[PDB]
Amino acid sequence: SRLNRESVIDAALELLNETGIDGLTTRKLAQKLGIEQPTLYWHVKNKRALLDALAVEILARHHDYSLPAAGESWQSFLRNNAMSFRRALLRYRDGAKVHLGTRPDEKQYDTVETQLRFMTENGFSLRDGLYAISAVSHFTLGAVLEQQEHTNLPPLLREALQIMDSDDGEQAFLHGLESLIRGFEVQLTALLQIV
């Protein structure tokens, strides 16, 4: 079939949904594309470089709230951005494991910069804004990893596992997110007081 960048990524995401990250190989990617392994090698050198590219394209295709709206609060932006990040990660099998370990790509340089300058325009230091941005990322990735990778009790534990089951963990994620944003807001409003 066609082996432009877009078709190779399309095939690899479709294979990812079929096999998961551990089972995704260049050999099964060559099979799905109806080509020999050395043909594929011209286009994609190894599994490392494939996963790096998926990680970037899944966010390019499906993370539609990278940027704040005109006049949006920093609280509302972090909320929307976290929900968008979570959705994009959940959209493919093992999607969070695909994202894990990746550093911003040159193609998202300007996005991450904008996020950080935006927080600095709203009264954060670069440091405090970085802390807030990393805490949202680390909380969101952790939540989606346990959700995806989870794919004679004592009473509380029994009832709790029941509660976590009754939805995907969207409730626990959205509640924790509100707690993190409020804690950031309490820190920011304090200035130099003891808080």
Ligand X SMILES: C[NH+](C)c1cc(NC(=O)CNC(C)(C)C)c(O)c2c1C[C@H]1C[C@H]3[C@H]([NH+](C)C)C(O)=C(C(N)=O)C(=O)[C@@]3(O)C(O)=C1C2=O
The binding site for Mg(2+) comprises 99
165 binds, among ligand X, Cl ion, a second copy, none (CB under 5 to 8 A by kind): ligand X
Quick one: which of 2, 70, 155, 191 contacts a second copy (CB under 8 A)?
A: 155
Pinpoint the alpha helices (H) of the chain.
Answer: 5-23, 26-33, 37-43, 47-62, 74-90, 95-99, 109-121, 126-149, 155-165, 170-190
Q: After which residues is the chain broken (C to N over 2.5 A)?
A: 151
How many residues of this chain interact with ligand X, rule: CB under 6 A? 25
Paired tokens of 112: 């991450």
Supply the DSSP string of 100-135, one letter for each residue. TT----GGGHHHHHHHHHHHHHTT--HHHHHHHHHH
Q: Which of 138, 167, 170, 189 binds a second copy (CB under 8 A)?
A: 138
- Residue for token pair 């994609």: 44
Tracing tokens 């970085």 back to the chain, one arrives at 130
d(CA 36, CA 38): 6
By beta-carbon proximity to ligand X, the closer residue of 29 and 89 is 89
Residue from 37, 46, 76, 179 touching a second copy (CB under 8 A): that is 179
Binding flag, residue 193, Cl ion (CB under 5 A): no
Residue 2 or 27: the one with the smaller Cβ distance to a second copy is 27
Q: Give the one entry of ligand X, a second copy, Cl ion, none that residue 49 binds, where binding means its C-beta sits below a cut-off of 5 to 8 angstroms depending on kind.
A: none
Binding mask 58-97 for ligand X (x = CB under 6 A): -x---x--x--------------x---x------------
Q: Which is nearer to Cl ion, 57 or 94 (CB)?
A: 57
From 54-62, 65-73, 75-83, 98-106, span contacting a second copy (CB under 8 A)? 98-106
Nearest in space to 153 (alpha carbons), one of 143, 165, 142, 144? 165
* Dist. CA 85–CA 65, nearest whole Å: 8
Residues that bind ligand X (CB under 6 A): 59, 63, 66, 81, 85, 103-104, 108, 111-112, 115, 130, 133-134, 136-137, 146-147, 150, 157, 160-161, 164-165, 169
